[PDB]
Amino acid sequence: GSHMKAVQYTEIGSEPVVVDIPTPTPGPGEILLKVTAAGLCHSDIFVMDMPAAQYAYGLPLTLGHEGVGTVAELGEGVTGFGVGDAVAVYGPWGCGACHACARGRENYCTRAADLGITPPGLGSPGSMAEYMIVDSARHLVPIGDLDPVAAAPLTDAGLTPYHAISRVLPLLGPGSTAVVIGVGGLGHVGIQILRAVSAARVIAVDLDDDRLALAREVGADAAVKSGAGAADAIRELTGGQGATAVFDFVGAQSTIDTAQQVVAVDGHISVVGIHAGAHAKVGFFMIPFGASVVTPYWGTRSELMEVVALARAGRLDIHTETFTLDEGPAAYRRLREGSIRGRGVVVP
Amino acid sequence: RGSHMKAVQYTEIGSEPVVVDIPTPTPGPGEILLKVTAAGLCHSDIFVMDMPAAQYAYGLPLTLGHEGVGTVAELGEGVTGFGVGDAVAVYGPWGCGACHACARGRENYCTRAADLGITPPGLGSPGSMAEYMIVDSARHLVPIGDLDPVAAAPLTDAGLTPYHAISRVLPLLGPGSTAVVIGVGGLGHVGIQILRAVSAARVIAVDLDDDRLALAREVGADAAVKSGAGAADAIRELTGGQGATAVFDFVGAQSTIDTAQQVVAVDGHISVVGIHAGAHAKVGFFMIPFGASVVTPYWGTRSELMEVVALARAGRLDIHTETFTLDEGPAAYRRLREGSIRGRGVVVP
Amino acid sequence: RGSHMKAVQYTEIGSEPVVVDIPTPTPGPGEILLKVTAAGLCHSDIFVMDMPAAQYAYGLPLTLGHEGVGTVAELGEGVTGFGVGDAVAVYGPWGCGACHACARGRENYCTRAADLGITPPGLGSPGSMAEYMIVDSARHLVPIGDLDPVAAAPLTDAGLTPYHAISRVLPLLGPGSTAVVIGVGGLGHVGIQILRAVSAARVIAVDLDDDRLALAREVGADAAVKSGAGAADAIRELTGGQGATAVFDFVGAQSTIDTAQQVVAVDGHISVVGIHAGAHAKVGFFMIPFGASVVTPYWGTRSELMEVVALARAGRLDIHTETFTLDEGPAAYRRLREGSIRGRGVVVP
Amino acid sequence: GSHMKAVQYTEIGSEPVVVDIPTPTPGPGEILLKVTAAGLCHSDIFVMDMPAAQYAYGLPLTLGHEGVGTVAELGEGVTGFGVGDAVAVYGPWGCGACHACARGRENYCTRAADLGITPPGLGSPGSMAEYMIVDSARHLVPIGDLDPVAAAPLTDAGLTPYHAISRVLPLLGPGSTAVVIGVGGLGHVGIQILRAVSAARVIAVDLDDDRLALAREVGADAAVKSGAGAADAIRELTGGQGATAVFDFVGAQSTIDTAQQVVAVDGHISVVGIHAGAHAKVGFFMIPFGASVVTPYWGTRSELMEVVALARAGRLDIHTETFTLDEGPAAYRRLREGSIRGRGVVVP
Ligand SMILES: CC(C)(C)[Si](C)(C)OCCC[n+]1cccc(C(N)=O)c1
Ligand SMILES: CC(C)(C)[Si](C)(C)OCCC[n+]1cccc(C(N)=O)c1
Ligand SMILES: CC(C)(C)[Si](C)(C)OCCC[n+]1cccc(C(N)=O)c1
Ligand SMILES: CC(C)(C)[Si](C)(C)OCCC[n+]1cccc(C(N)=O)c1
Ligand code: NA
Ligand code: NA
Ligand SMILES: [Zn+2]
Ligand SMILES: [Zn+2]
Ligand SMILES: [Zn+2]
Ligand SMILES: [Zn+2]
Ligand SMILES: [Zn+2]
Ligand SMILES: [Zn+2]
Ligand SMILES: [Zn+2]
Ligand SMILES: [Zn+2]
């Protein structure tokens, strides 16, 4: 087909729409995928909530930064993959040539911004379409016979918490404690990751009673209600020592404040969730000595392969609700209203 | 038949239509009285009732309904051609019948109707939204046979108007041509079906709403893109940069007209069918491609209305309908104003 | 045909239904897969979805739609009696098929369904509001021939339920008898048409709206009176104090039941068809005439559904319908909640 | 067992023989029964005395339309019974989808003939074999711990008179009179049914004093010898008012004439027995006003359940003579010469 359906953001402040666009063809080094699953998440809502005042360029944009597909056509010179191979799309594309990229950490590429290299669905054409172009073979990760619908959330919902945890994994030995604030999406996956790759005690923190109960099912050793009393309740559980690491998947100022009140000396706070303007306050006597704080970004290539390995070993379970490509906009409406249980996945 | 009838009338400016109790008309010589079987309502009725009172000169009261269908009730003196009970659709844009335009069949472009005060039913003359109505002459009736009156009523406007616009330039729409339809509401929805039935042109739809884009594909649009600033680029993306032989703008907003001028092909056509007061195409050198003609078409001809009925009876035209009673008349208009009707509302006595 | 299909499901207690993408079912041995052509909605769907969470056991997720019509898409192993393409309506109140009541055709009164967990489609089993549905057995399909599926769907409930209630005492409704119909909404006005088609009983209608009384007269009611404290006297005025042979209360409120007991004749009948939680007739000496039986009937039998279909195909039954798409499902149920639908809403995949 | 013994009618004009045939296997929706009792009735002889032109049940034919057994194997998708359940077979199979079938009256199915649906032992394989197939679960009726030998006659010898009586049961109130002509196979059960489901007086009519004596034991209030004097005798026993209902299980022209001579105004005559060419003459002044006549056929499924309920309550006592499967053909010779006391039953 000379044209294909794509879920696109086409004007500021509007809803995504299913529109017909030319079917792309892979240039030298590129790979054309037939999309099999395209995950959606609140990051898409955040991008689509950006005001017009800040807008400079990017429209129209094919959505979808959580992409899985089968190789449909290989660009000239591409080897290492064959037509039909099931692959997940590595999201945070880098230049491949800087020191950070050479070390595998393309998500921290120091040249991507200058070169205008943007992730699919966030500046480059995304995966919510019948077909999609991938710029380079090194951004394809094989998934074998893993269900594409289960693999799609792993590209973001699994990779991002896995990276945040991986940054300080050597600290999470037996006797350590990891606090997870927000146990619904990324945090639910984070708890499973923590139980698979460490022996740390896991304390779940959330506003909803039901989410906390589900957090215990996937390995959380204790549960705490988010809010003003959370810090004291957490210290009650850890004794007077505090938490080795706090992974804040909410990112609100109140949750960041709680993290600073419970993190242990020489600990770590990871601000994964995004709330505009919210920030940790790292200064003497405002945070324990040696407690580092960071805003991590997505994850590395090898980390995505490790997430796929966890999923294929049965250590990662992410509940998904499926939609057709025609229902792309409907799925985003459901996402806004909070009626999606699990992670939405578009299946073209 | 009784001596009084229910009717829905615009009775005073700025007010909503109301059900009333008026006498049953009687057919004079050459006239025909019909038992209305379906009376379609349309946003054009809304446009008329939105007329500011400062513009008002005369007209009220006015039985609404310019999309009329019914069965012959009583033949006026000397009226041959139809027998009582014959199912007929009412041709809307009444003309004088004697000028050059009328003699060619194009009564919608009659050059004397304005001077003579000849007005269409429901838009100056007693409309179809009543138990009976008067049709001035036999030539303003089109037989429909066993066609469902509810299916026929919307096609007197939602079918005839796009059909005429398309017919004006149909010879240009051969195989290999591309026709763009902006606005996939009632008019554009049927316009796409017409294009597929009477031509081999590729149809590309444009609309604001995702569900209307999906509707366009269902009824034969090969492709559909969202209206707005990027609409012209998205169309030329699908055509390989060539541009459309014809653009039928059933919205008529200035932004949609702008899009049409940016995608129409050299020696093409733009048809401004939808009305937005003040919106206009700007036909000038280097502001529109060479040879691309622009027009604002008006309703359609009688022979075209017959062709629309033949298309409908062959199963080539479909429009979603919502049936109401006369007492629900005003309620249907409020539903129309709030934009909750998909397709066309139709009042069934 | 597609490995996945669209459906409208009730997924959370207190939450509106949503469109979902779920696997296309495959018919097992003895089952039949239908391509749905129409799926009706009615107030009973709201009653179910309004149930509090405290009383929730295991029903979710539930594909809604207990008024199903479609065409046979695939026959399960060993199924005979229908061919691919046959138009059929779905019999709602599924039973075990093996008890005495089932062997008599009265599956709606099966004495084993509750113990065995046999639930109707859309009320425990996957309903008809989807592109495809499974029917457990060929004995729950009723051929409809060329009957319009949109007209057939509401009659699986709105026709069958009054038809059964009337059929329970049809021998009493001979010439000279009087049948009172309370509530001329969906079920009641179909009930009026049934009474006129299958009996010579004089029909008196009772309703609140003045508009409903006129409609009752149009569809066959010989007389109509206003519901309220004066309805009992008004009815007895028309019957001369003899009382009404049968009273079919399609409202089911306590006040309407009280009026029923006040007008029902000696040796007559009251049928409490409408549901109002807690409302009940009081059957005791000198609180109701001697010999006047009272019952709360439930849906109808399979042979009765066959007879309802035969009445519809003979043009004796008519219910106003309003069609929606599967994507419009949730919006249609909202329309029903606010009481904006006249007649019955029908979802057409 | 790959094969099984069966009593089959293999050629026109010959006696049934015990032959070996493949053991059937149940298809989807079917049930395989291990037969525990198979009854013989004169209808089998009538079928076997048909000339070549009239016979339309195909050859070979496994005989036996009075079948009872235990569920041996369930066809695909058959729920409702378990292996080992004792069940009686409903004989007059119908389409299950016509108006008559939907009302439970499968015996009066209007499409069975056009569709080739025939009863077991009368077009379909019968019960006089080690195993038999039943087309559908709805044609099985549980019997509990009822003795299969006593249960087999209930499927025809009980069901058929029960249906004939049920057609006009509302007429047989206290003060009514029911005349039973032929108190052998079916009339013996008819007398017991009448006493169980009605208060009508029962007058027995038969040729043999032996048969009349038994009729009086099972509830017949009076006995009359069949012949030209029966009509006068019956009216003498009822003054001159007549019999509300006459159930003629002989079906001969002479007995039908006796029925028409004794039936009451607005009464009923049921011609249950079959004698080719015999017929009632329903015309003005040839029969009392309002006296309806009918030839009933077998019975409905709900009536079979009611017959089973009567037997399990001790209300039906069927006189049986048991035979082995190898004795099958011999039993039919016994039935031919009228040397069987009551009902013959083969027990495989
Ligand atoms: C939140 C960002 C500003 C980085 Si955004 C809208 C460009 O995320 C898209 C990349 C997916 N994802 C989702 C949530 C969190 C993160 C993370 N903490 O890296 C990444
Ligand atoms: C208010 C309108 C300007 C649309 Si009026 C009063 C000309 O519509 C009545 C005739 C029906 N119809 C509807 C839409 C468009 C046209 C057309 N392009 O002719 C005609
Ligand atoms: C079992 C349910 C709780 C869903 Si009920 C009783 C609201 O109806 C479902 C069956 C449809 N219908 C609608 C109205 C009345 C009746 C009736 N009188 O049988 C039946
Ligand atoms: C009905 C048939 C003509 C095929 Si006959 C009599 C050979 O047997 C089949 C059913 C067996 N049975 C025996 C006795 C009486 C009756 C009855 N009155 O129905 C039925
Ligand atoms: Na536009
Ligand atoms: Na009342
Ligand atoms: Zn994401
Ligand atoms: Zn780099
Ligand atoms: Zn119009
Ligand atoms: Zn003119
Ligand atoms: Zn219903
Ligand atoms: Zn049952
Ligand atoms: Zn027999
Ligand atoms: Zn049948």
Side-chain angles (χ1 to χ4, degrees), chain C residues 182 206 226-229 231-232 235 255-257 259-260:
Chain C
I182 307 178
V206 183
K226 192 202 174 48
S227 173
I235 292 153
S255 56
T256 53
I257 289 167
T259 302

Side-chain angles (χ1 to χ4, degrees), chain A residues 3 10 17-20 22 329, chain B residues 210 217 222-224 226 237-238:
Chain A
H3 60 79
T10 65
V17 288
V18 183
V19 292
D20 297 279
Chain B
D210 181 56
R217 299 186 192 95
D222 175 56
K226 179 165 160 87
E237 217 82 84
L238 286 161

Side-chain angles (χ1 to χ4, degrees), chain C residues 97-98 100 103-105 302 306-307, chain D residues 96-97 99 102-104 301 305-306:
Chain C
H100 193 260
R104 277 201 299 141
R302 181 160 35 120
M306 293 195 186
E307 294 162 17
Chain D
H99 191 265
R103 285 175 59 216
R301 177 158 52 116
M305 316 172 149
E306 291 161 28

Side-chain angles (χ1 to χ4, degrees), chain C residues 40-45 66-67 157-158 344:
Chain C
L41 53 141
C42 92
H43 186 68
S44 309
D45 290 332
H66 59 270
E67 307 182 2
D157 183 4
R344 280 279 180 290

Side-chain angles (χ1 to χ4, degrees), chain D residues 8-321:
Chain D
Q8 291 205 318
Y9 187 49
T10 70
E11 99 183 42
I12 307 285
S14 67
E15 277 185 305
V17 285
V18 178
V19 295
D20 288 284
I21 61 174
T23 299
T25 199
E30 297 189 326
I31 300 91
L32 185 76
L33 302 181
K34 174 156 199 328
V35 176
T36 50
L40 309 78
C41 92
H42 292 264
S43 325
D44 299 333
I45 274 146
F46 185 93
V47 168
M48 275 180 293
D49 286 343
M50 280 179 166
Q54 193 171 32
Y55 180 84
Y57 296 145
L59 300 182
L61 162 64
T62 299
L63 298 176
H65 63 268
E66 296 182 11
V68 169
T70 57
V71 177
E73 180 175 348
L74 300 153
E76 261 218 286
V78 171
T79 56
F81 302 90
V83 173
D85 289 349
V87 293
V89 179
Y90 181 67
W93 295 353
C95 78
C98 71
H99 191 265
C101 281
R103 285 175 59 216
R105 305 168 76 74
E106 278 199 44
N107 52 326
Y108 298 123
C109 171
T110 56
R111 298 161 33 181
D114 285 359
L115 300 172
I117 304 174
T118 52
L122 307 163
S124 292
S127 46
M128 217 147 82
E130 293 173 42
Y131 299 86
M132 81 179 297
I133 288 278
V134 177
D135 66 323
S136 182
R138 79 166 178 287
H139 295 147
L140 297 175
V141 164
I143 57 166
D145 58 13
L146 202 58
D147 177 26
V149 166
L154 308 175
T155 57
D156 192 357
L159 178 56
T160 288
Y162 189 89
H163 174 65
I165 292 155
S166 291
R167 288 182 70 98
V168 294
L169 184 51
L171 313 173
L172 305 180
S176 72
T177 302
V179 166
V180 179
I181 291 161
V183 297
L186 270 56
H188 188 71
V189 193
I191 288 165
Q192 297 175 70
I193 290 162
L194 284 160
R195 294 277 287 182
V197 305
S198 98
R201 194 151 86 104
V202 185
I203 301 183
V205 181
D206 198 280
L207 288 159
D208 193 339
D209 308 278
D210 164 80
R211 263 153 154 62
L212 298 170
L214 283 318
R216 214 138 182 162
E217 226 58 74
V218 296
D221 300 279
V224 176
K225 218 134 190 283
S226 210
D232 286 318
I234 287 154
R235 301 208 82 108
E236 247 289 299
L237 280 169
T238 67
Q241 298 293 268
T244 313
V246 186
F247 301 97
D248 184 9
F249 298 103
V250 183
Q253 186 58 62
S254 68
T255 47
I256 292 176
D257 296 337
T258 301
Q260 291 190 227
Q261 266 162 264
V262 304
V263 70
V265 175
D266 210 23
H268 180 70
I269 296 167
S270 198
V271 181
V272 185
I274 184 157
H275 270 88
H279 62 274
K281 295 151 180 63
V282 183
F284 281 104
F285 301 128
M286 326 177 54
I287 195 172
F289 292 144
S292 66
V293 188
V294 72
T295 67
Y297 177 50
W298 221 330
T300 82
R301 177 158 52 116
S302 61
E303 292 172 336
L304 179 53
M305 316 172 149
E306 291 161 28
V307 166
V308 172
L310 282 173
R312 286 176 66 65
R315 318 292 262 290
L316 301 178
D317 189 58
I318 313 272
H319 302 3
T320 57
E321 186 181 354

